[PDB]
Amino acid sequence: AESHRLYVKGKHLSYQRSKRVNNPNVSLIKIEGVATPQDAQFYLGKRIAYVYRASKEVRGSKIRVMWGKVTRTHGNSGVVRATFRNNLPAKTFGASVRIFLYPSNI
Amino acid sequence: AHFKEYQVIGRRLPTESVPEPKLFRMRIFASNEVIAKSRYWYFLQKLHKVKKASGEIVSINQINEAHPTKVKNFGVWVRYDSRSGTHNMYKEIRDVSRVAAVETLYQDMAARHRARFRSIHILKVAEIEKTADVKRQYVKQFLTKDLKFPLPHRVQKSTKTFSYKRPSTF
Amino acid sequence: STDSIVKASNWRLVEVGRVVLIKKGQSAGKLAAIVEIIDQKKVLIDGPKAGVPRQAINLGQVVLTPLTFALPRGARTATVSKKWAAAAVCEKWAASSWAKKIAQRERRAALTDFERFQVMVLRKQKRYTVKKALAKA
Amino acid sequence: VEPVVVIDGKGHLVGRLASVVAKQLLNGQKIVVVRAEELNISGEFFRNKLKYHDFLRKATAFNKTRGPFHFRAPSRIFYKALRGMVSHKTARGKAALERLKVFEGIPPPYDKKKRVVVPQALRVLRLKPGRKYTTLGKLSTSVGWKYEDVVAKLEAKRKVSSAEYYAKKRAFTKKVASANATAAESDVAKQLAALGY
Amino acid sequence: MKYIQTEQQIEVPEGVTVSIKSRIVKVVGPRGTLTKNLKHIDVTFTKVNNQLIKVAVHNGGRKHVAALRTVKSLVDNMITGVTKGYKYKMRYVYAHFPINVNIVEKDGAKFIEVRNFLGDKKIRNVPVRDGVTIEFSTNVKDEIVLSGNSVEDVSQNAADLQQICRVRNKDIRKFLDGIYVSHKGFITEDL
Amino acid sequence: GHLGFLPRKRAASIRARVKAFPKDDRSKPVALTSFLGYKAGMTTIVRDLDRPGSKFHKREVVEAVTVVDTPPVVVVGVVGYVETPRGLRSLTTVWAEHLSDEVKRRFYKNWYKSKKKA
RNA sequence: GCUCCACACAAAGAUGGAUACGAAUAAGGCGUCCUUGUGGCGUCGCUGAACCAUAGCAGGCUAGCAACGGUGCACUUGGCGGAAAGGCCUUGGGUGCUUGCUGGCGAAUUGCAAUGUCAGCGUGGGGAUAAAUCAUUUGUAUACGACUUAGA
RNA sequence: AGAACUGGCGAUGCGGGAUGAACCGAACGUAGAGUUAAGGUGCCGGAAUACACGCUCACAAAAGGUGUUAGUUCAUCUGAACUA
């Protein structure tokens, strides 16, 4: 096919933060097409994978990934807190985060 | 909030070897029960000499609407105090119940006349059973015959951050 | 020519006996009609037909419609029903292009994946025909 | 949702459009604003002119060279009121304020791309009618921006060329939009109508 | 108080045909057609049948109806402006100082020529518009008639003449010789 | 002194530049809108003049003056400038397809060591 | 900038499509009528949730049925775009594709997930081209600078 | 001025107050998940360009407004003086 995308796309935004103290445990995620929390409830628990490049070829491929889940809803507009294993670099606020579809429970 | 309107009846306590006092009754409009009993004490201290502990309270009721789908007209006598003592006031309110009027009155008292929920004391509310007893012009503005107006320049609220439409009122 | 050019701007008008499409509530996309008017904002709506309970409403929640009929001042449930079907507004409504649209996206919503695949292959064929036939002149 | 949105300024306000363009930058959606002349502001032309001048009298005493500057071409007024809303100290903001490109008019090749609007910053929707407002290009012309006459001359060029294209296109569509009518009512069309289209 | 509806009365006589864009209005008449942009009025026009027009502010207010009634006066000034027209007779008074006013056309000017009013060695000119009929009246010495369609314009350039004549610096009533508008009225009569 | 001229420092150019031009007119001949001289020498001239009403009228007068040497000047090429809502902008420089020596010499700071391949 | 040899990259965040009148918003499009209107008739909008595109090993190899399409690429006509034009249409052949229709062979073993893919290029040393500089001279410049001449 | 009581600071972090010895909360072992106080939810910045009815065009205290909205009391057919 032309389009093999199996994953909704999204934007990384912030770490969770107070007005001053951030808490870079849990990235906050914006999801494309979710405008509302009850839309979120579908996504909670899928596997987010942040994907980027490294010019030094590591495993035989220069494309690297961090994985992680999506835990709970955030705010009324449908931000969704995700926590990766190794926290997102904060180099990327507003970079495209991919939200796969599985675990699949419907 | 949504108001609810409580019939309230004090027995206020009978003295020694004196039975069954005069069982005062009032209609208070609150948003819940405790606010009511709060008032019924509050006013009832003033309306003649008593005291909270000295008295008692018996009956409480939520008096539902009479006929909630009949559009009804009202007029209302207010006592509210600012800066100095009150000025007893009167209005007319066109709405679908007793409660809806009372509410709208509160919002209005907050919108202009600047006296808060402690201060306002409903004296009496009444439906206007015929027409033409309606003096205030803004009310009977709608009492005319064959009444029509359009949407005053419809404002649609789009739920996205982009439209391609160059939207129109229409 | 001597007839004037003043015109037209014919819009929807609040008035008794106007079917309104309620856009949010427990109705959320049904029809009712305006019994009678309270003031610049609040009105009293109902129809027993589409199920909407008769209630006050603040016009924000509700969009007017091109369709209306005739009806007394402060009518009632049964009445508004009899006048309703008497006016056959349901037929009239659904006949329109508007309601065709609402029904359209409603159904496109319900497409099963496989159904959606049907839709792919068909539109491929149909497209191919229109392209064949067109661009021959 | 496009890689690059081309946003129109006509009929918008500043503060509202500014805020939105901002936050969208901080989430990394590239933006090219266009037709800055056409922008609007609350308030009559007087009040705005006063606030701007009262910003013209803010300078630095020892020397003006690094002190408060003043900008004219509406793109730069908008740009200002926008950049106030980004943190341009950090590398976040500076990485954002690069994603924003403001123009005046519609320079190539953005004519040929579909423009969009922001429904929450439009004037027609927001401001209550019968209440004064201001057009930006005016204000900026009266604070010394000189080029307004040229801009019109260029748009009165584009709009003509535009109108030609939009003509032919529509004309073309009349074929297809009518052509489909013969492919209608056929079986396959009956189905595609039953499958929800 | 937000009046729910408001309308005022307009009648278009058979002599004139009123054609209206969205809000922009043009009157056709025997004398001349008038064009006016109402875009700043914020209001709705309706017609009953062919003789008449009602102006409507829906969901009214004070300032807003204040604008409405004025557009009543402007459609009027268009109607009465074309057929019955407007005649303003201006009068340039002098005794010792001969006044020279000559309405001349240079480059298509038709501007107005004022001199030796209170002893000037320089020519005080006034610009003029289209739609003004100028005449130096015969049968009356020391007077001039300017007429036309638009109240706005005839009294506009009439006011613009009486204010080129300002006498300051000096005694106010010294010379009540001056430039005045003697007549304010129509062309017809008996209309 | 005046704050007209700020800031203080030198004029970076040996030849000045022309910061204005007479507007234009469409109905004229093609006209040479300006020209540049070489001032050579100061001097003084006596004369008389016609100035009615002035106290020097028809009256022999003396004042110093300045002379400027003015070679008749040679033209090579044309550049039209488009107008853009930034400023003007050039399109292309053109020339005479034969140039004099000196204008060639404008394109070399070192003339003798160069290859004259310009 | 070119040529030779020796050796180094490659022969702030993508994964269908950035999908184009303008103007008012107390109003406008679209089709249509006729004389050409500030006209008549119809109709639309109340979301882009739209529209196109989309099947085939990450997209193979092969049989035809229709139809002269659609589509690629490279040759190619012609015209337009100078607001940053570098973009768009277009004409003419070939080349491949086809999913509009029906065929036949291939896939595993990557073992139940842990993207699992499909965004000519500088080095340093030669040869050559054109320079520019220091230096030298001059003086309209000048404290040093810096600047202006001349030196084939 | 010192009169008394009674708190808080002195030995004291943390959330908010754009910033602060005196203000609003809040007791400090290290961590994980949840829930709130105080304060807020245009952007800077986490959170509703939410919904609702209304008002207005940014210590000086008594005031003036042919401002504006709603009421008060007097009399005709709308007026007067005022109150908010």
Curated annotation (Swiss-Prot), chain B:
Function of the molecule: Component of the ribosome, a large ribonucleoprotein complex responsible for the synthesis of proteins in the cell. The small ribosomal subunit (SSU) binds messenger RNAs (mRNAs) and translates the encoded message by selecting cognate aminoacyl-transfer RNA (tRNA) molecules. The large subunit (LSU) contains the ribosomal catalytic site termed the peptidyl transferase center (PTC), which catalyzes the formation of peptide bonds, thereby polymerizing the amino acids delivered by tRNAs into a polypeptide chain.
Note: Present with 54300 molecules/cell in log phase SD medium.
Protein name: Large ribosomal subunit protein eL20A
Originating species: Saccharomyces cerevisiae (strain ATCC 204508 / S288c) (Baker's yeast)
Protein's gene: RPL20A
Cross-link (Glycyl lysine isopeptide (Lys-Gly) (interchain with G-Cter in ubiquitin)): 124, 130, 148
The keyword Cytoplasm appears for this protein: yes
PANTHER family: 60S RIBOSOMAL PROTEIN L18A
UniProt subunit comment: Component of the large ribosomal subunit (LSU). Mature yeast ribosomes consist of a small (40S) and a large (60S) subunit. The 40S small subunit contains 1 molecule of ribosomal RNA (18S rRNA) and 33 different proteins (encoded by 57 genes). The large 60S subunit contains 3 rRNA molecules (25S, 5.8S and 5S rRNA) and 46 different proteins (encoded by 81 genes). eL20 forms multiple interactions with RNA and proteins in the central protuberance, connecting components of core functional centers that are located far apart.
Swiss-Prot record, chain D:
Disulfide bridge positions per record: none
Keyword tRNA-binding among record annotations: no
CDD domains according to UniProt: Ribosomal_L13
Pfam families: Ribosomal_L13 (PF00572)
Highest taxon above the source species: Eukaryota
An example Gene Ontology molecular-function term: RNA binding
Keywords for the protein's UniProt record, in alphabetical order: Acetylation, Cytoplasm, Isopeptide bond, Ribonucleoprotein, Ribosomal protein, Ubl conjugation
Cross-link (Glycyl lysine isopeptide (Lys-Gly) (interchain with G-Cter in ubiquitin)): 175
InterPro entries the record matches: Ribosomal_uL13, Ribosomal_uL13_CS, Ribosomal_uL13_euk/arc, Ribosomal_uL13_sf
Keyword Acetylation carried by entry: yes
Post-translational modification: N-terminally acetylated by acetyltransferase NatA.
Location in or out of the cell: Cytoplasm
GO biological process: cytoplasmic translation; maturation of LSU-rRNA; negative regulation of translation
One cellular component term from this protein's GO annotations in UniProt: cytosolic large ribosomal subunit
Job description of the protein: Component of the ribosome, a large ribonucleoprotein complex responsible for the synthesis of proteins in the cell. The small ribosomal subunit (SSU) binds messenger RNAs (mRNAs) and translates the encoded message by selecting cognate aminoacyl-transfer RNA (tRNA) molecules. The large subunit (LSU) contains the ribosomal catalytic site termed the peptidyl transferase center (PTC), which catalyzes the formation of peptide bonds, thereby polymerizing the amino acids delivered by tRNAs into a polypeptide chain.
UniProt similarity note: Belongs to the universal ribosomal protein uL13 family.
NCBIfam families: L13_A_E
PANTHER family tied to this protein: LARGE RIBOSOMAL SUBUNIT PROTEIN UL13, RIBOSOMAL PROTEIN L13
Other noteworthy facts: Present with 43300 molecules/cell in log phase SD medium. There are 2 genes for uL13 in yeast.
The name this protein goes by in its record: Large ribosomal subunit protein uL13A
Organism of this sequence: Saccharomyces cerevisiae (strain ATCC 204508 / S288c)
Swiss-Prot record, chain E:
UniProt xrefs under PROSITE patterns: RIBOSOMAL_L6_2
GO biological process: one example: cytoplasmic translation
UniProt keyword annotations, A-Z: Cytoplasm, Ribonucleoprotein, Ribosomal protein
Subcellular location: Cytoplasm
Gene3D superfamilies tied to this protein: Ribosomal protein L6, alpha-beta domain
A Gene Ontology molecular function term of the record: structural constituent of ribosome
InterPro entries: Ribosomal_uL6-like, Ribosomal_uL6-like_a/b-dom_sf, Ribosomal_uL6_a/b-dom, Ribosomal_uL6_CS2
Keyword set includes Chaperone: no
Cellular compartments per GO CC: cytosol; cytosolic large ribosomal subunit
Domain of life: Eukaryota
Something else known: Present with 52400 molecules/cell in log phase SD medium.
Annotated function: Component of the ribosome, a large ribonucleoprotein complex responsible for the synthesis of proteins in the cell. The small ribosomal subunit (SSU) binds messenger RNAs (mRNAs) and translates the encoded message by selecting cognate aminoacyl-transfer RNA (tRNA) molecules. The large subunit (LSU) contains the ribosomal catalytic site termed the peptidyl transferase center (PTC), which catalyzes the formation of peptide bonds, thereby polymerizing the amino acids delivered by tRNAs into a polypeptide chain.
Family statement drawn from the similarity comment of this UniProt entry: Belongs to the universal ribosomal protein uL6 family.
Protein name from the UniProt record: Large ribosomal subunit protein uL6A
Organism of provenance: Saccharomyces cerevisiae (strain ATCC 204508 / S288c) (Baker's yeast)
UniProtKB/Swiss-Prot annotation, chain F:
Cellular location(s): Cytoplasm
Residues bearing PTM Phosphoserine: 13
Cross-link type Glycyl lysine isopeptide (Lys-Gly) (interchain with G-Cter in ubiquitin), residue numbers: 28
Coiled-coil zones: none
Modified residues (Phosphothreonine): 92
Domain of life: Eukaryota
Disruption phenotype: A mutant confers resistance to trichodermin, a trichotecene toxin produced by plant-pathogenic fungi.
Protein task: Component of the ribosome, a large ribonucleoprotein complex responsible for the synthesis of proteins in the cell. The small ribosomal subunit (SSU) binds messenger RNAs (mRNAs) and translates the encoded message by selecting cognate aminoacyl-transfer RNA (tRNA) molecules. The large subunit (LSU) contains the ribosomal catalytic site termed the peptidyl transferase center (PTC), which catalyzes the formation of peptide bonds, thereby polymerizing the amino acids delivered by tRNAs into a polypeptide chain.
Assembly description: Component of the large ribosomal subunit (LSU). Mature yeast ribosomes consist of a small (40S) and a large (60S) subunit. The 40S small subunit contains 1 molecule of ribosomal RNA (18S rRNA) and 33 different proteins (encoded by 57 genes). The large 60S subunit contains 3 rRNA molecules (25S, 5.8S and 5S rRNA) and 46 different proteins (encoded by 81 genes). uL3 forms together with ES39L one of the contact sites for the signal recognition particle that targets ribosomes to the endoplasmic reticulum membrane.
Additional comment: Present with 450 molecules/cell in log phase SD medium.
Name this protein carries in UniProt: Large ribosomal subunit protein uL3
